Amino acid sequence: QQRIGVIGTGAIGGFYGLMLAHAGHDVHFLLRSEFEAVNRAGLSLNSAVHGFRRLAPVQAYHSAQDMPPCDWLLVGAKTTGNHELAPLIRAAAAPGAKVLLLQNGLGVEERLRPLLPESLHLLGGLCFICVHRGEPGVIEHQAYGGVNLGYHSGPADERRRREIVEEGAALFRESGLESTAMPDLEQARWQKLVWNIPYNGLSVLLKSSTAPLMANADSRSLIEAIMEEVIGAAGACGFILPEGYADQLLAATERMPDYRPSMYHDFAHGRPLELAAIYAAPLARAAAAGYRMPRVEALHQALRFLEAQP
Amino acid sequence: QRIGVIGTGAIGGFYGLMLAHAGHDVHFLLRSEFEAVNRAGLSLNSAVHGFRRLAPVQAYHSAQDMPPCDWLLVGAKTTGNHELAPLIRAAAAPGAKVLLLQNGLGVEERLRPLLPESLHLLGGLCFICVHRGEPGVIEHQAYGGVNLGYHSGPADERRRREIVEEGAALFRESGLESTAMPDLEQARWQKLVWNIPYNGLSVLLKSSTAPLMANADSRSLIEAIMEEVIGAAGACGFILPEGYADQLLAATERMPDYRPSMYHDFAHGRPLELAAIYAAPLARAAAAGYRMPRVEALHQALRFLEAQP
Numbered sequence: 001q002q003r004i005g006v007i008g009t010g011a012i013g014g015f016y017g018l019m020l021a022h023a024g025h026d027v028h029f030l031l032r033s034e035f036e037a038v039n040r041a042g043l044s045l046n047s048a049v050h051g052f053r054r055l056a057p058v059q060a061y062h063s064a065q066d067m068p069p070c071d072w073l074l075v076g077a078k079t080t081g082n083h084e085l086a087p088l089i090r091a092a093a094a095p096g097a098k099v100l101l102l103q104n105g106l107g108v109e110e111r112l113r114p115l116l117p118e119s120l121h122l123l124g125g126l127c128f129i130c131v132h133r134g135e136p137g138v139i140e141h142q143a144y145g146g147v148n149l150g151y152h153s154g155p156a157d158e159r160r161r162r163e164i165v166e167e168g169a170a171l172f173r174e175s176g177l178e179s180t181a182m183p184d185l186e187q188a189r190w191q192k193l194v195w196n197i198p199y200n201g202l203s204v205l206l207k208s209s210t211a212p213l214m215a216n217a218d219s220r221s222l223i224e225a226i227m228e229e230v231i232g233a234a235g236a237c238g239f240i241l242p243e244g245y246a247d248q249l250l251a252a253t254e255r256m257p258d259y260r261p262s263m264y265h266d267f268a269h270g271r272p273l274e275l276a277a278i279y280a281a282p283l284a285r286a287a288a289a290g291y292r293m294p295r296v297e298a299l300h301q302a303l304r305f306l307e308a309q310p
Numbered sequence: 311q312r313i314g315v316i317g318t319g320a321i322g323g324f325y326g327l328m329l330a331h332a333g334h335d336v337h338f339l340l341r342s343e344f345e346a347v348n349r350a351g352l353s354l355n356s357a358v359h360g361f362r363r364l365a366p367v368q369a370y371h372s373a374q375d376m377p378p379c380d381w382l383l384v385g386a387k388t389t390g391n392h393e394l395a396p397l398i399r400a401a402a403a404p405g406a407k408v409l410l411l412q413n414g415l416g417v418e419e420r421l422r423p424l425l426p427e428s429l430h431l432l433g434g435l436c437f438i439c440v441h442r443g444e445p446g447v448i449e450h451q452a453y454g455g456v457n458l459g460y461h462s463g464p465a466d467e468r469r470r471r472e473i474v475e476e477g478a479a480l481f482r483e484s485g486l487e488s489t490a491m492p493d494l495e496q497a498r499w500q501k502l503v504w505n506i507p508y509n510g511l512s513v514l515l516k517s518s519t520a521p522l523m524a525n526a527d528s529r530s531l532i533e534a535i536m537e538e539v540i541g542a543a544g545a546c547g548f549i550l551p552e553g554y555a556d557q558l559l560a561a562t563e564r565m566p567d568y569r570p571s572m573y574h575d576f577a578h579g580r581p582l583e584l585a586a587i588y589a590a591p592l593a594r595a596a597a598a599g600y601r602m603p604r605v606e607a608l609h610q611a612l613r614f615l616e617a618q619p
C-alpha cells in the first residue's frame with residue numbers, strides 16, 4: 001500500500017526493508033558495495049525471531065535517481081557520511097515523503113536537516129535489535145527488532161506529527177515487528193545512549209561480546225558506572241530518565257543472547273565507527289551544561305586511539 | 311658491604327650489575343633464568359652508559375645458599391610476597407637493609423609484617439626504562455636514577471637519614487643518580503603519576519610509549535589520568551611538585567619507544583601488578599573521600615583483560 005525506499009541497505013536497512021516487503025509493501029532498495037550481488041542473488045535473512053526470509057527478485061538500485069518516488073524513506077546508512085547521504089534522499093522522495101533515520105546517536109536529525117527540503121518530514125527511528133551483515137546478501141538477525149519512532153521536523157502541525165509517527169509505527173507492526181510512538185525523540189535518543197555508550201565502546205575496547213562483559217564483575221561495574229554518567233548527562237541536559245533505569249537495562253542485557261554490538265563489527269571490518277554521533281555529541285552537549293563524564297570521555301579517547309592505530 | 315639481589319630481573323639485574331661493576335660484592339638470586347645466567351653471565355646493553363659484562367657472576371637458585379648480605383636489593387615483582395618474604399629473610403644479615411626496587415603504593419607496609427623488625431625496610435623509586443631481552447641480557451634504554459626512602463625498621467631519626475644516605479651513596483658510587491627522599495610515601499605517589507597511566511594504557515591499548523604520546527587522544531587521556539593521581543596524592547596529604555605531569559610528559563617524549571613492565575607481564579602471561587599500582591592508590595584515595603573515575607575504570611578494564619582466556 002505504501003512505496004518504501006531504503007537508503008543504505010545494510011544490516012538495519014536490509015532487515016526492516018525486507019520485513020516490510022514481506023508484509024506486502026512495495027519496497028525499493030538502494031545499495032552500495034553489494035548492489036550487484038543483491039540485485040542478482042536477492043536478499044535473505046537468517047533470524048532467530050522470524051526464521052529464514054527471502055526476497056527475490058528485489059527492486060534494487062545502485063543510483064538513487066533510478067528509484068521511483070517513495071512515501072517513506074528508511075535510512076539505514078551509518079551516521080558517518082551525512083553529505084554523501086543527503087542527495088540520495090531527495091532523489092527518492094515523493095512529494096512530502098517521510099524520512100526515517102534508523103540510526104543511533106544524539107543530534108542526528110538536526111545534523112541532517114539543513115540538507116533536506118522543508119517539505120520532507122524528518123523522523124528518528126530507534127531500533128532495539130541484534131543484527132549484522134553476516135554473508136554477502138545475507139542478514140543475521142539474532143534478537144529483538146522493535147523500532148520506536150519520533151518526529152523531529154517538517155511541515156506537520158502537532159496533531160499531524162502524531163498521526164505520521166503512528167502511521168510509521170503501524171507499518172512496522174503490520175510487518176510483525178514491535179513498534180511504539182515516542183512522545184519525545186530527543187528524550188528517547190538520550191535513553192538509547194545509556195545502552196550504546198557503554199556496550200558499543202567496551203565491546204571494541206575489551207574485544208568482547210555482551211555475555212563476558214556481563215559475567216565479569218569488574219566490566220559489569222564499569223558498565224553501570226558509565227550508565228550513571230550518561231543518565232547524569234541526560235539529567236543535566238533536561239531529560240530525567242526513569243528511576244533505577246541502569247538496573248533495568250543491566251538486567252535485560254543479562255537475558256540477551258551473546259552479542260557483538262554494531263560498533264564491534266564496524267571495528268573488525270575496518271569501517272568508520274560512529275563515534276561522532278554516539279560519543280562526541282553527548283560529550284559536547286554535557287560540556288555545554290557543565291556536566292563532566294570522565295569515563296565516557298576517556299572511553300571516547302581510547303576508541304579514537306584504536307581507530308587511528310595500524 | 312655484602313650486597314644481595316632478590317629477584318634478578320631487569321631491575322635487579324641492572325642495579326646489581328652496576329653495583330658489582332663498581333667493585334661491590336653482589337650475590338644474585340635467580341629463578342627461571344638461573345641456569346642461563348650461571349653459564350653466560352650478565353650482559354648489560356645500556357643506551358645511557360654502554361656495554362658492561364659480568365662473567366662469571368655469583369648466581370644462586372635458592373636464598374638458603376646465599377651468604378648474609380648487608381644490603382638486599384629486591385627487584386622482584388609485587389605479585390608474590392608469600393614467595394618473596396622467606397627469600398629476603400634467608401639472605402638477610404643481622405640488621406640488613408632491604409631496598410624494595412618496586413612500583414606501587416603501600417608496598418613496604420604490605421611486606422613489613424613478614425620481615426623481622428630488626429631489618430631496615432626501604433623503598434627505592436626507580437625512574438628507568440629497562441627490560442630483559444634474551445636470557446642473561448639486560449636492555450637499558452633510558453634514565454636509571456633511584457631515589458631511596460625509609461619506611462620501617464629499628465633505626466632512630468638520625469640513623470634513618472644515614473641509612474637512606476648510605477644507600478644513595480652506593481648508587482652514586484656506581485655512576486647512577488640517586489637522591490635521598492625525606493618521605494617515601496610522597497615519593498611513591500610521585501612515581502605512580504607515571505606508572506598508573508602508562509602501564510595500564512600500554513596493556514589496554516596494546517601499545518608502547520611512542521604511539522601513546524604521538525596520538526592526541528591518548529596523550530590527553532594520559533594527562534587526565536595524571537591529574538587524577540596528582541589530585542589523589544594531594545587528597546591523601548602529599549602535594550606533588552607543580553607541573554609534574556608536564557615534566558613527566560617531556561621525559562617520556564625523550565624516551566625511546568618503551569613497553570612498560572606491565573606490558574611485558576601481560577604478554578608473557580605473568581600476573582599483573584594491579585594490586586600495588588591500582589588497587590592500593592584507589593583504596594587510599596577512597597579512604598580520603600577522593601574519587602579517581604578514570605583510574606577506577608582503567609583498573610576495572612585491566613582486571614577484565616587479565617581474567618579473559
Ligand SMILES: NC(=O)c1ccc[n+]([C@@H]2O[C@H](COP(=O)([O-])OP(=O)(O)OC[C@H]3O[C@@H](n4cnc5c(N)ncnc54)[C@H](OP(=O)(O)O)[C@@H]3O)[C@@H](O)[C@H]2O)c1
Pocket residue numbers: 007008009010011012013030031032033034076077078079081084085088102103104105127128129130131132133262274
Ligand atoms: N544491530 C545493528 O546493527 C544496529 C542496531 C541499532 C541501530 N543501528 C544503527 O543503524 C545504522 C546502520 O547500522 P548497520 O548495523 O546496519 O551498519 P551497516 O551494516 O554497515 O549498514 C550501513 C549501510 O549503509 C550503506 N551506505 C552508506 N552510505 C551509502 C550511500 N551513499 N549509498 C548507498 N549506501 C550507503 C552502506 O553500504 P556498504 O555496506 O556497501 O558499505 C551499508 O550498506 C547505524 O546508524 C547504527 O547505529 C544498528
Ligand SMILES: NC(=O)c1ccc[n+]([C@@H]2O[C@H](COP(=O)([O-])OP(=O)(O)OC[C@H]3O[C@@H](n4cnc5c(N)ncnc54)[C@H](OP(=O)(O)O)[C@@H]3O)[C@@H](O)[C@H]2O)c1
Pocket residue numbers: 316317318319320321322340341342343385386387388389390391393394411412413436437438439440441442571583
Ligand atoms: N624499567 C622497569 O622494568 C621498571 C621500572 C620501574 C619499576 N619497575 C618495577 O620493578 C619491579 C620489577 O620490575 P622488572 O622489570 O625487573 O620485572 P622482571 O623483569 O620480570 O624481574 C622480576 C624478577 O624477579 C623474579 N620474581 C618475580 N616475582 C617474584 C616473586 N614473588 N618472588 C621472587 N621473585 C620474583 C622474577 O623471576 P623470573 O626470572 O622467573 O621471571 C624475575 O627474576 C616491579 O615492581 C616493577 O613495576 C620496573
Ligand SMILES: CC(C)CC(=O)C(=O)O
Pocket residue numbers: 104127128129130196200260261262263
Ligand atoms: C539493541 C542494540 C544492540 C542495538 C544497537 O544499538 C547497536 O548494536 O549498535
Ligand SMILES: CC(C)CC(=O)C(=O)O
Pocket residue numbers: 413436437438439504505509569570571572
Ligand atoms: C620509569 C618508567 C619508565 C618505568 C615503569 O613504570 C615500568 O616499566 O613499570
